[PDB]
Amino acid sequence: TRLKIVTIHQEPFVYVKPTMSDGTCKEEFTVNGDPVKKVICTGPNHTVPQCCYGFCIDLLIKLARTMNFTYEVHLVADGKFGTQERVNNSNKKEWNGMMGELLSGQADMIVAPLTINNERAQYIEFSKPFKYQGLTILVKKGTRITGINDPRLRNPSDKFIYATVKQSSVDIYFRRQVELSTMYRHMEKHNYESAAEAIQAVRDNKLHAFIWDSAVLEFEASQKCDLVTTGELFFRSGFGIGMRKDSPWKQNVSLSILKSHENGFMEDLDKTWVRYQECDS
Numbered sequence: 001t002r003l004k005i006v007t008i009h010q011e012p013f014v015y016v017k018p019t020m021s022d023g024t025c026k027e028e029f030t031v032n033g034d035p036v037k038k039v040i041c042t043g044p045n046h047t048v049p050q051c052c053y054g055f056c057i058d059l060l061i062k063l064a065r066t067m068n069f070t071y072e073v074h075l076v077a078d079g080k081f082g083t084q085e086r087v088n089n090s091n092k093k094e095w096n097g098m099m100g101e102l103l104s105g106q107a108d109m110i111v112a113p114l115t116i117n118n119e120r121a122q123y124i125e126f127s128k129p130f131k132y133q134g135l136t137i138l139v140k141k142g143t144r145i146t147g148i149n150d151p152r153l154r155n156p157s158d159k160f161i162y163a164t165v166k167q168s169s170v171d172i173y174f175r176r177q178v179e180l181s182t183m184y185r186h187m188e189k190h191n192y193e194s195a196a197e198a199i200q201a202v203r204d205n206k207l208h209a210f211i212w213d214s215a216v217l218e219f220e221a222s223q224k225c226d227l228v229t230t231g232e233l234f235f236r237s238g239f240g241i242g243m244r245k246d247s248p249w250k251q252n253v254s255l256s257i258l259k260s261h262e263n264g265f266m267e268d269l270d271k272t273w274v275r276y277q278e279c280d281s
Contacts, residue, residue: 010112066252
């Protein structure tokens, strides 16, 4: 009966914290003074129960209420979003990350900042976008780069290292475009396992530029005054809920998302989780 929901750590959409010593989740309040809704999410720390909250968790709760379903949340085991790759040193291809879990049945729905792209749409179904965003670049304040067309990115050198997250939509964006071959070849040698690690690397001067989702990078840069983004987005894409094709939830999930875009719910999530205070971290 319970839907198996898979998600991934990705602030401000999904925060992941340890439970308190008694197994419960710390009582916290939003900027508006309301209780922060927290759900138990099992996953690698060893796999244990942890506390999850954020933009996507509030969205999941809204969907569950509106569509009248129960659920259990877990964090993707390999910590990745999902790309299709050859496995077991053979020519057989399988999806990794949340994509792989949804296709295998380990999950029934992906509720996370999951990018809608053509490659994934060939295998799964997406709801209409719950968030409209794109791609941008994160650098340390002081680093001078124009954007995706900067010579230090287009004419790669070991003097200026840039990368993205392994097995993600951004990795595929660069891998599937011949014009971006030189950039792809450079990043392939530097890609990180998670967005948090890449962001920390930029802060520590170990990575000079991190190419990633603007919804995430603009939030990170706006919370940390030592980090900035390169301005305008160089590509636009949306985040959607993922389900297996021919699922009984597709129509209703999109109806819920439509209602939330129409009545201010999505806008309120932005004021609660994305734009609400000056930098302090």
